[model samples]
Structure formats: structure tokens, C-alpha cells
Target: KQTGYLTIGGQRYQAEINDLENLGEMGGQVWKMRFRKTGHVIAVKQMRRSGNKEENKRILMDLDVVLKSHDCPYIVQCFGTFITNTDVFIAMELMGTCAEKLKKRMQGPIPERILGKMTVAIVKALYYLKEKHGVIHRDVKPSNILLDERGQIKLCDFGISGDVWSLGISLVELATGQFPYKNCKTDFEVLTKVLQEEPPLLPGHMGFSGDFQSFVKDCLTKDHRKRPKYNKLLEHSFIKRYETLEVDVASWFKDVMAKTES
Candidate 1:
């Protein structure tokens, strides 16, 4: 089943979706759709419109930011927006996998070189958002950072201090292959611990370099003011170190994918 066709650009095309098969991810609201005319595979996000304008306004925010972003390399791209009798559809770009899935599949610590690349790309994305537009991606995390088949990283879900802090958190998670706060049984305890103590270090046992620990500290500092913004972060030694080097990310990603089941 499809919703009132798909309107993208100035023209409209019928969305081919089969609900009976394994054709989608999100239950009932999202689907894997292909436009026959464009011949591109696109995933559709469906949000039901309430009589209230708040939800529509929220969707508009999501719609226009991605639309205006057009050619930004690190950000997720959207085909266009469509309106139906009761739902708004956004045909967002499809990605191969997310950092979370990758982490799970590999079941180990992420390499320094890989995390360095991720830091550069993610910081570039965050910096671009703030520099080009006054927007902040308040919810930065591993899952939100998507990896395409080409092994390129891109940001999809959007958030600043929170973003930076969360990035710090995700960095540790990526490298360590475990949640740092797994000990915290509740959100309250997690918040209490985070606020009360210094940020966790990349355990010495991991043998991660001092520069990486330094960078992680900058992100997870108890004081938000001490946390560096995107500009300052770009100049950081860790990021600068990898900025000039190249790694075979495609092979690494493929090798990881080869070992996993879809």
C-alpha cells in the first residue's frame, strides 16, 4: 500500500510499496519505496498530521533544512516532501548501515583511524550546520551517524553542548564497544553520575593514544563551557592528525559486513 502517490520536485510519481512482504523497517509508518520514473530507491517517512499546526511545523522544519542543505556532503539528503489526506511523506536518502549496527556486527573496539575519520566527518557536518545556518544538531549519537555502502559517513538525525557531549559519549562507545554507563540502572543515576564525576577515559588497557584520550576529555567535560565547539574541534590535534592521511575504509566496512547476517 502507498499513500496518495509521491510528489517530488515539480512532478509526481506513484510509490511502489508492498506491505505483505519485508518491504520496510519502521512498523506501519515507513517503507522502502522506489519511483519508477526516477529509477532511484528511496525510503519513505510518513507522519500523520494532526489538526494542530505544531506537528506540521515540526515536519516543515525537518523538510526545509534538508532541502536547503541540498549539496552538503556530510548531511542526509531528502528527495522532496509530499502531502496526502492525512500524512506527510519525506523520501529520504537510503543508507547502508549505521554506526550502531556496525559496532554490533563487529563486536569490538573501533580502530583509532576509523574513529578519527568519523570525528572529522561528524565535526565537519556539525560545523557546517552552525556556520551555514544557525541550526544545532542537539542529538548527536552513533546510530544517527549513518554509513553508506561507499563507506562514507553522513549525519541524518539532528542536535550542540548536548551534541558535543553526546559525540564524546558516542566516541567512547565506538572505541570501547560498550556503553560507558552500563552500570547506571536508571536515567536519573546516569545523569547524576555524569554530572557529578569527571568523564571516563579511554581505558589504558585499550592502548588508545594520549591524543584520543585528550579529545574525549574535551567532549565529556562536566562543564559545558569547556567543551569545544566545531571550529575549535577542527583544529584539535587528533582531528588534524587524521585529516592528512587516508585509510581503506571501504575494505574494512565490507569485511565487517561480510561476517554479518542481514
Candidate 2:
């Protein structure tokens, strides 16, 4: 008998028990499964069906966003999706590690050049989503930013919300080696501060460039109407300055990894 394949939405994909490894769980019951199919490694996220109309709608909403943004280079590509009576499975491109892990492994803050490249990739994706698709990434934290060994960075886990503020927070964390609102003791306090006070800023001693600092400040402007949109932000000098640099972010990551392992 020929090897059986998994049927998802009328299409068949070769999958096997030995090929599957549980990466982890996210957002409650959604499990991240890493597997190989047709000579390519892929990620399969399976979310349990809650049987609630709202819950199912949210799952489908995510699928729609992924499908629509699939063609963008900086956005995670969703190969396809499979629906079961008890769960919904989305297959996407596999990535090596996320920004959070990379940042944690680094000895200090990520270099501004690498950070600029990463930001460009992210801004490109967000720009496409907002300008081309009329959507927002809502969630733009370091944990949602994945990068491969080749230095290709992608933004993942999008929803219907503005990304400018989140991007500001991400940049601040990269520059400072800590959360932007680390002084806040609780979630409530952090929320309050986010609403009432000015957005966080990099310490003066961090040696960040004036243009970069100004770009971040513009991103976190309390008045959403005054904040620069993705396209405008993409033109800022901070990102434009590194557009021609040939930095090997992958090599940098490897060096950091080696150092941390020692």
C-alpha cells in the first residue's frame, strides 16, 4: 500500500509521526508543531475548537490575515490550512529563532545597524499590511519577530490594531536591554503609564543616534493622529542610513550564540 497523506481542505500533504515535534503552545490551546514535508521544514499550529461562535470566528480571522499577507517577504507565509472536527491547523514557513531569544543571548543591546535592518524588514511588512491590505499588525513585540540563520526577519501574529506603539516599545527594548516600562510594578500600572505619560525613551548613555531616537519618539507620539505612518517612518534617516550597509546579522547572531554557550 502507498503511504497515506494528511488531507487538509481537499489538498493532500505528506506527514508522518516521526516527522512531528512539539515546539510549544501559545494563546491557550494552540500548539506549535514542527514537521518536515516534501523536503521542506514547516510549522503547523493547531488550535483546539472551542465550539463557540466567537472563538471560531477569531481563528478564521487569523487565517484570513495570514492568507492575505502571505506574499509579503517580511511576513510569515502560510502554506495552507487544515480543518478537523476538533481543531484547526495552519501550516506556515518555519523560522530559526525569535528576536526575544536572540536578545536574551546577546551580551548587550543589539547593535543599531542590525536593529535598523530588522526594523526595515518589520516596517516593510507593516507598511504593506496597512497601505496595501488596510490592516494593522496589532502585536509587534520582539517575541513575534522571527529571524532565520540567513538574517531574514519576519513579523508574525498579526491582528486588527495599530502597530506604531508596539514598534516603539520593541525598538526601546532592543536599545535598552529591558522592557520600556520596566519601572511599572504591575500590569495596571503599566497600562496607566502607557496612557497618561509620554512613551519610554532610550537612556542618554545608550549612545543611540539622534535620528534613531527621534524616529522612535515619533512612533510613540501619544497623539495617534500625529504619529508617522509606516510609509513615512520607513523614510526616516534611522532606517535609511543602514539601507546600504552589508551587515551579516546571521554571523553576528552565531557569534553571540557561541559566546553565550561558553
Candidate 3:
């Protein structure tokens, strides 16, 4: 009576399709698919339509990059890849809900504590993207972030993303706001310019300033030449405030090594 549950590899899953909440309307069909085994769940991004072999291969390669980096606590974990007759299934850690939706439910800006944690998480993710993976998450917005049951943030959607896109958006704007670059009709041209020319300083937008000001500046800069790298972002005022403990550095390095080895 209902569409058969999407099968991954040889394993058959019974997904409550109706209960599978829509995380976002983006480049492809991304959904939250649950499984009975291990009481585990994952987001399945279905790749549709035809594509060039080179680009498709690059897409798969990008997925591998994320898996190999094993850096950043906020970056969602890619369990494995599964192929169906029509789709490429990317099994990833499930974040039950997202940040934007939660902020809307609260009927005001997200609390400072939550926002601080989120900012740190995102900065940490960016650090990994630059240092470990040598990639850039072109789209760094609120809707792309997820919050698990433990209240930890998990970033998603690397399909339309590329290494060339960068934004140093502010945390305040990220929490209480919308993506300013959504209006940019010349993203393709701008990216080309970045590759060829220099990026400019970006003033913080949408009532965001101070600690978040610097972050937004780096993110929105058009010139990669003058732009701050992810390591600099990790040391930015916004991120450093919450990262007062040096112990995390040692712990993180060890954990990352283990994940990489695994």
C-alpha cells in the first residue's frame, strides 16, 4: 500500500516515511530515515538526475574527504555509503532536529549558552574543513546545522558545497537571522573571481557585530587571498571565549586519530 522502504545494500529497512521529518529543501531529496537495528537512524540524501562522470566521481570523493578528516565534533559522521537502483545513500549520524526550527519554537533568539556552543561547534567544523580536509563548506547557514538529542550540533549538506566557497558570518546573525548571501545572484562569478583575484573585507550584516563580527567578516569576504583560514577562525574571539580549556586540544587530537584509524 505504501512505497516500499528504501533499501540500502542488502539490508531491508522499515522506515516510517510519514514520520520522517523534512530537514530542509535543498539540492536533493534529504530525509531522516530510521532503522530498528541499534535503534539507529541516518539521513539519506538521494542523488537524482544524470550527471557527468567526472563531477559524480568528485562528489563521491568529497564524501570520502569528510569521512577521512575525522575532525570537528559538530560535523556529522558519515557511517557508510549504500547504493540503491536509483539513489546513492549516504548513511550519516542522525540529528533529530535542526537549529533554526528550535530557535523559531523558542519565539526569540536562541539563548547565549546555546548560541556560544553552536558557534564553537561550527568554528571547530570549519577548522577541520580547512586544515584536515582542505575543503570549504560554501554554505554555512543555520538551516544546515542539526541538534541531536544530546543537544550537540551536527552540520550537514555537502552535496552542492565546494572547497572554494567561504563565509565568515557572525554567530548572532546565524542564530537570530537568515543567510545574507542568499540574494547573491553572482555566486558562480564571485567564486571565479575568488579563484582568480582577491577577496574583500565583508562588514557584518543583519544587526550582528562584536564577537560575531570577525567571523562574518571572514566568511563573507570575496577574496580568498586576504581571508582568514580555519585555524585563525578557531582562535577568533568568538570561538576562543568558549574554548578556555587547553585540555580539549589534546583530547581532540587523540579522538581524531582513533576515528581516522577506525
Best by TM-score: 1
Q: How far is 41's C-alpha from truth in model 3 (Å)?
A: 2.6
Write down the TM-score of every candidate. 0.84, 0.81, 0.59
Candidate 3 structure lDDT? 0.55
lDDT (CA) per prediction: 0.76, 0.74, 0.55
Q: What is candidate 2's CA lDDT for residue 30? A: 49
Report the poorest 10 consecutive residues by lDDT, candidate 2. 1-10
* Candidate 2 positional error at 181, Å: 1.2
By TM-score, the candidates rank as 1, 2, 3
lDDT of 3 at 241: 70
In candidate 1, what are the lDDT values of residues 1-262, reduced to their tens digit? Answer: 2234555545666554331123567423556776656666666777777645765566567666777677687887776566666767777777778898889888889898889888988999888888887788788888788887677888874322227888999999999999999899899999898888878768888788888999998888788777788888898899988788797777888888888855
Q: How high a TM-score does candidate 1 get?
A: 0.84
After the best TM-score superposition of candidate 2, give how far the Cα of residue 22 lies from its true spot, in angstroms.
5.3
Candidate with the greatest lDDT versus the true structure: 1
